[PDB]
Amino acid sequence: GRYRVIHTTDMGADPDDEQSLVRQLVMANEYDLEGIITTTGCWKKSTSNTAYVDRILNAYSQAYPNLSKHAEGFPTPAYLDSINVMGQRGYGMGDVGSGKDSAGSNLIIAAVDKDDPRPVWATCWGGCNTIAQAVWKVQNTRSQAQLDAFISKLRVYDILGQDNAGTWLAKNFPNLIYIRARSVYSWQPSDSYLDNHIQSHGALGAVYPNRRYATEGDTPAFLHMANPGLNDPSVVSMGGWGGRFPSKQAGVRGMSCMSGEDAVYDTYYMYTENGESIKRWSTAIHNDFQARMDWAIESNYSAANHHPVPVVNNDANEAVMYLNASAGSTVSLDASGSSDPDGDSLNYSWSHYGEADSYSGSVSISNSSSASANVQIPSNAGGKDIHILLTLRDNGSPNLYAYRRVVINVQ
Ligand SMILES: [Ca+2]
Ligand SMILES: [Ca+2]
Ligand SMILES: [Cl-]
Ligand SMILES: [Cl-]
Ligand SMILES: [Mg+2]
Ligand SMILES: [Mg+2]
Ligand SMILES: [Mg+2]
Ligand SMILES: [Zn+2]
Numbered sequence: 001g002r003y004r005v006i007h008t009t010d011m012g013a014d015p016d017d018e019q020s021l022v023r024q025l026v027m028a029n030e031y032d033l034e035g036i037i038t039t040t041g042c043w044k045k046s047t048s049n050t051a052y053v054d055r056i057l058n059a060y061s062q063a064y065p066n067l068s069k070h071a072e073g074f075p076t077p078a079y080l081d082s083i084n085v086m087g088q089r090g091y092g093m094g095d096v097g098s099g100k101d102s103a104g105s106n107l108i109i110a111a112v113d114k115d116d117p118r119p120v121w122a123t124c125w126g127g128c129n130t131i132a133q134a135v136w137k138v139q140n141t142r143s144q145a146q147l148d149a150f151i152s153k154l155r156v157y158d159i160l161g162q163d164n165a166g167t168w169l170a171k172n173f174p175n176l177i178y179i180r181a182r183s184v185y186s187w188q189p190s191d192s193y194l195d196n197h198i199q200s201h202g203a204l205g206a207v208y209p210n211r212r213y214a215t216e217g218d219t220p221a222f223l224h225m226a227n228p229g230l231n232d233p234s235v236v237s238m239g240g241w242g243g244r245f246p247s248k249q250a251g252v253r254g255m256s257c258m259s260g261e262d263a264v265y266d267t268y269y270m271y272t273e274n275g276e277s278i279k280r281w282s283t284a285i286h287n288d289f290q291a292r293m294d295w296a297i298e299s300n301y302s303a304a305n306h307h308p309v310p311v312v313n314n315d316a317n318e319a320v321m322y323l324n325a326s327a328g329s330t331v332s333l334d335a336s337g338s339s340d341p342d343g344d345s346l347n348y349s350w351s352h353y354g355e356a357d358s359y360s361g362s363v364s365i366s367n368s369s370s371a372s373a374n375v376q377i378p379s380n381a382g383g384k385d386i387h388i389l390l391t392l393r394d395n396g397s398p399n400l401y402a403y404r405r406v407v408i409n410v411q
Contacts, residue, residue, distance in 0.1 A: 001318040002073075003225040003233060004118050006035035006108060008087050009218070010126025010162070011052035013044035015209035017125050018052060020219045022198075022208045025060050025080075026292035029071040030226055034111050034120065036080065037104035039087030041126025041162035042257030046090060053084050055207055062203035063296040070295035070304060083107070087130030092163040092261070096133045105133035112153050119234060121155045121225060125218035127163025131156060135169060135176075151176050155234060157221045157242070158270075159184060161254025164261040171268040179236060179245055180252045180270040181220055187278035188215040189286045201293040220278060223285065229310060229318045230389075230403035236271050238320075238387070238405070239356045241285055244277040246355075284391075284401035291400055305396035308346055310404040311337030312390060321406045328379035333406055334372040335390050344394035348373075351389045353405070359384035381410040 007024070009017045021036070036057075038050045061077035068074045087104030088095040108131060111120050122131045131154075138150045155177040158166045170178045191211060199205045224233045224242025231240030238244070248269040253262050262268075278285075294304035312335050315321055325331050335348050350368040359381050365388065366374040375388055390404040 001228055002030065002032045003228065004032045004034055004111070004116065004120040005222060005225055006037065006111060006120060006122045007033075007222070008035075008037040008039045008104065008122065008124055008126065008128070008130045010041040010044040010047070011038050012047065013041065013126060015212050016214060016217050018056060018207065018209050019211075019216045020125065020222075021053065021056050022204050023216065023219055023289055024222050025056070026063070026067065026204065026289070026296055027222070027226060028075050029067070029073040031222070032118075033075060033080070033083070035083045035085065035104065035107045037085055037087040037107065037130055039104060039126055039130045040089065040091050040095070041124070042091065042255060043162065044126060047086070048089065050084055050086060056204075057081060057084060059203040059207045066297060066299050067295050069299060069301055070306065088127075088133055092127060092129055092258075093132065093165050093168050096129055096136050096165055096168075100133055101137060102130060102133060104130045105137065108134035109138060112150055119153050119155055121157060121233065123218075123221040124156065124158040124162065124166055125221060128156060128158055128166030128169060129163050132165035132169055135173065148175070157181065157224055159218045159221050161252065161258065161262065163254070164258060167254070167262045167265045167268060170270050171265040174269065177234060177236065178270050179224075180254075180272050181243055181245075182252070183243060183273040183276040184217050184220050184278070185214055186276045187282045187285065189282075191215075193286065197290040198293050202297040204296050205293060223278070227403055229320065230405055232320050237356060239277055239353065241278065241281045243273055244275070244355060245271040246274050247271070287398040287400055290398050305344070305394070305398065305400050306341050307400045308340040308344070308392045308394045308402045309338060310335060310390055310392050310402050311339070312404050312406060321404060322409065323406060324409045324411060325377050327377055327382040327410050329377050331375045331377060331408060332372070333375060333388060333390070335392065335404070336371045338371070338392055340394050340396070342394070342396055344396040346371075347393040347395070349391045349393070351391065353387040353389050357385050357387040357407075359386050359410070363388075375408070377408065377410055383410065385409050
């Protein structure tokens with residue numbers, strides 16, 4: 001019920017990285033976070049220490065006693081300290097190669113090598129060169145088969161393209177699942193929301209800085225993995241809080257601080273959006289962070305809201321649900337069972353996520369605002385899939401959401 005994620009971040013380039021780390025930390029019970037790596041990108045080409053992260057983790061240690069009363073599985077402060085390390089200290093592929101290992105690059109290697117069947121995500125909040133150093137070292141020291149196996153267990157989520165090393169990865173390792181997300185600017189909350197709901201809330205709020213340019217431009221790089229019941233982030237066409245990536249595109253260019261650098265790698269492909277795809281989730285996203293900052297400052301469970309818990313057809317697993325059904329049949333999807341741990345009331349909303357599925361037509365859902373819905377599988381849907389989403393919403397303060405996607409493979 002959790003995904004494995006390692007973040008690499010160019011702390012100091014812009015306050016948004018700090019903002020993003022605060023949100024990730026109050027969401028950390030939903031993940032297996034395995035690295036917080038301070039590194040570079042074209043907006044911050046040199047770095048020397050982890051002091052930004054140290055400061056934020058000190059705040060986390062003050063919030064952790066409260067956070068841990070609100071959900072299971074928050075990582076300990078000691079554990080987070082252990083995975084707070086330096087990555088590459090210089091820029092791009094110019095800091096990749098012989099003698100250039102970092103704590104962060106080695107951390108990535110060790111995570112990918114681990115005997116956990118789950119893949120691991122490595123992200124680029126700045127450049128991707130700490131990931132590139134890891135892959136370069138594996139390529140330089142292991143067999144082809146061992147390199148292919150390594151690549152098969154990795155995924156990269158690159159925000160915007162901020163060094164030439166991400167491009168080097170996409171070009172040289174075409175079997176690596178690689179997203180270069182660019183439509184990361186349309187979902188953000190207001191500065192007043194931040195002041196009132198976030199920054200005022202205790203020690204973690206005090207290390208959440210104001211926006212300089214954009215708020216939390218890098219945050220999609222973990223929201224992609226926030227909701228196992230909504231989306232499998234390795235199926236990048238599904239859509240979810242990190243966006244929807246329907247195809248690979250050629251020559252996806254990075255930011256202006258690396259102009260001219262991508263082109264030497266042509267032709268290369270990267271998954272990227274074909275349409276902004278985060279804003280649709282914004283209400284849920286904003287309410288989520290609001291409630292979690294309440295968790296951070298309330299010592300009593302009773303004093304904050306917690307997410308509702310979906311069940312569909314007596315299946316309580318926090319994962320995408322897969323069903324096979326015949327064309328021209330009706331499928332009952334019953335979310336009775338679902339619960340709320342605060343005793344809130346629930347609202348049920350069923351939708352056809354037609355952007356995400358291979359069926360080209362429309363799909364009728366009866367009683368789509370009720371717990372117990374019925375999906376009409378078209379007679380012409382054979383050989384396609386149909387994605388049906390349950391969105392569950394409580395009436396707590398603020399309203400919190402939960403999801404279950406049902407993927408119906410039609411015969
Ligand atoms: Ca950044
Ligand atoms: Ca609730
Ligand atoms: Cl955007
Ligand atoms: Cl979408
Ligand atoms: Mg404060
Ligand atoms: Mg989406
Ligand atoms: Mg469709
Ligand atoms: Zn609050």
